Amino acid sequence: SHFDLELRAAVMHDILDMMPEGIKQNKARTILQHLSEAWRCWKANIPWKVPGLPTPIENMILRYVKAKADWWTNTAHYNRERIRRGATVDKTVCKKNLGRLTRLYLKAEQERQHNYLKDGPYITAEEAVAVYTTTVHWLESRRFSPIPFPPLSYKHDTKLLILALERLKEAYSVKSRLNQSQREELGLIEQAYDNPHEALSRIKRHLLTQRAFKEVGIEFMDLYSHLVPVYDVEPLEKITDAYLDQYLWYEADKRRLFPPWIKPADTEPPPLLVYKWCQGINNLQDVWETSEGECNVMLESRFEKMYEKIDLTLLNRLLRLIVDHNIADYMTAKNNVVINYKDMNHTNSYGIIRGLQFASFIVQYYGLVMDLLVLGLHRASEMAGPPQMPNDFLSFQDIATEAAHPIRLFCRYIDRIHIFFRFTADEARDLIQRYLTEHPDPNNENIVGYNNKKCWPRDARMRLMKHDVNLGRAVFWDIKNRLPRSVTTVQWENSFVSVYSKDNPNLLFNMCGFECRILPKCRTSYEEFTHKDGVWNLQNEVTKERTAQCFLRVDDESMQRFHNRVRQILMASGSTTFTKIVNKWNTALIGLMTYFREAVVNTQELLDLLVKCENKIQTRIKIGLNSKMPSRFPPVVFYTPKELGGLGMLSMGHVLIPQSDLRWSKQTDVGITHFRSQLIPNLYRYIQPWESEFIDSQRVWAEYALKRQEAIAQNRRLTLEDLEDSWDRGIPRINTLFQKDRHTLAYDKGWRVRTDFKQYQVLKQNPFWWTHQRHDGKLWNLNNYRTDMIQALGGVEGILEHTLFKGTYFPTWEGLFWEKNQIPNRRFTLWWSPTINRANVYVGFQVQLDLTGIFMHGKIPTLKISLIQIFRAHLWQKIHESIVMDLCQVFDQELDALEIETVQKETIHPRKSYKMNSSCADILLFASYKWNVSRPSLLADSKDVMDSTTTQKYWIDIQLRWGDYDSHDIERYARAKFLDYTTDNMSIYPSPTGVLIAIDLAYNLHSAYGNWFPGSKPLIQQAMAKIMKANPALYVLRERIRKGLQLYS
């Protein structure tokens, strides 16, 4: 940005150095004010003009604005090219780049609307008369009765208003802190709840009277690949628009306006649409027979600029056939309003406002007008059937009208069309001749420019023989001729045509994100039947034998959108908690897997991408804990559920739990007992595939139908007793019959396309756009995942050894609770300190804290800030002195039973409590006459054989420990320290016979090793039990740990 500043300085020097000194003293404080105002007026698209300005300096200002505009535009495009390819950048760069490209798109839209106002309507009158009379003939062929205006009391207005207000309040239920303009909207919605009939009167008055509307705001959703607009509407108009949306869909569903080929439907998740499309391709009359030169053609395409090229007057003329005319005038009047972005106002006159409530109707009706242009009236009448007996989706009247025409399968998702043709030899030759008559090809150039699917192998995708390529070009030409280019436009570069012939053994398409390859049984090898996931087995309806296979993959745009979502998650700041990142990863991973259920297993690049993104997410937390890279890191830090203090991260990968990390220990009155309890369970095994979920849906709904038919005749109401088998089953879950809102949700028609079009109204992204839980029920179960996750990590006692739990002295876990979704970083680090601060995690570098015996592996400031707070004010030395004084008061009483003549407390040096190179004795006992000593043995060892080495002096030393997950065995530690400190030239002990008592604070363990005179060992066992139960300094340490961890009971 410094080069632009040097350029501005050079421009100002070239301006000021020409004028003399009496004008240098004036124009240094004259030009600089409006110099920024001219650039501001350019950026706000305001025409810059000021009187009293000379013309060469005005041309200099215009050259300055033009040069900075070119620099700014190329900088914005280069910044978008940096973040599109995946290069890392600061978040403020993307936040400014979104505004720059928002202003550029607004300048483009304001230009193209004025170009439409200047050049006139781009549609001719004859094409308008053609589509108008076509719609008239179609609606008179079906006897469609128009949608009436709701007069005074339709007796369903209350339920529709309730549904509209629920869909309006569905967005604001995420966060509990809102803005004032949002509080005003919630207040208006609550006032609409309080008085429904006044709200209905306001809606009907705005319908019959109002034609002017407040300005609609625009924002852009920041996808890394493609910008998408979100519109903001005034709430008083928004309530009326939502009620109009509900009433139009509920009337159009009853009047049967939409033919069954128009998709999405309310019955179907889009993978069911793909499955039924594959079954419809399979079940045709002799579809794979190519012995006489027949061909199959699969066209898929998209209507380019369908949303921007709708003329509003033509829309009103086509809309007045189906509703009341005031309703059509209200639907046209909302589209002609001023769009604002923060400085920029422009009116809308061409193209619809896609972010409206009722706009979900407008796209689905207008695109119906496209079906009369593409499919033809005769073939649409043969597909839909009579009005008194309509056909099903991908079904015909008879077989003769099925095979009477080549255009024999048709489907339209919102703007993507999928057509399937069956040609003979002579029809294909005639179509290729009709193509080559107008478009000759002397050099065979129609191979270059052919869109093909590179994700498949070379023998698996389309083989480009010349006849099949010419047939595909002819098919796309014949479809493109039927559409007037002023109304809609299809393009070859955005389309795809697959051909199945003698030279092409398999058929390809892309639909609903799925890459599908269909391959017949009779075009391949023998029976072998090795079962694979992502392989659908296709069978006939009549003979029920196998005919073909369907191979599923995930397309490239879904994987790129997922990788952009991972890059959005990795844009979290340093103050962001770890749990928010893990929750975003879990939401994204469920939104990937539960939609692409059976096809993630078949594609290998997505399985590599999931593991790569998961390791980047774990590395984001690894760098956040410590700056230095760890050599190892336990997965039980991550995959522990949030109830036990972990993160609850979902798994897609091959992670093996290492041995000797499933061990745990427990100390009781008989001593220290050890116990020993593998792969982390994956997500894809806990989700049903689509094919089994479809076959079971048909079964349970057939059994429901038979049970309902039996229950009607017996005067019996079906209850939970008869349906407690078919629970959790059906595509719409059977569980949805046991809604409280049956009469409420039964009036909601067309909910799936509305849920899909919520993306132009809400600023946040929407995973699970393809479903709604009240209408479908719930489509995954993950309690088994958490159960197997707790079971796979070695149990709760196996997890809690990593978690500093035994430093808190709670007897159980079940009565405990956390102080309140999210856990902070300090509490997480102090909780998982025994498994992070280990020797085999940060290799080599270790230090010691000053006033404690805590060994810090590496350096962790986020744990140091807690270990200073816990162990402040010499608590280590106070605990040591308290244990020494309590044991001295133990040895003070019961004097004659052990023949003790003098107990002596040694002068303890104030650094002795935490130095670990050497030690010294703490409590010295003098024998009255003589004491028999035993061999050096453990505290719990009872096989003691005493020697004749009678000694008088006895010494007792107290040692403290702060261990970790692998080194916390206090018995071998006390034995090693005894054998070290009794066999060295630096430690000082006045007696060769003694004992060392070791206490580990991080797990609260205690043991002893050394010599034993008679009567000393049960006394020391009971004394150390009494101390570990009743030391007040240990109680201060425990209450400080429980205060730091925020863990209560």
């Binding site: 593991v611 050599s631 091959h654 994956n682 894809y684 095994r685 959790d728 309690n783």
Partner: peptide, 28 residues
């Protein structure tokens, strides 16, 4: 075993997709 999540390519031989997936009982 230094962390290092691995890919599932080739590491599924006897594991299907629908296996070890259970449904819930009706509540009360």
């Amino acid at each position: 075993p230094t962390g290092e999540v691995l890919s599932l390519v080739g590491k599924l031989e006897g594991t299907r997709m629908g296996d070890k997936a259970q449904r819930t009982k009706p509540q009360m």
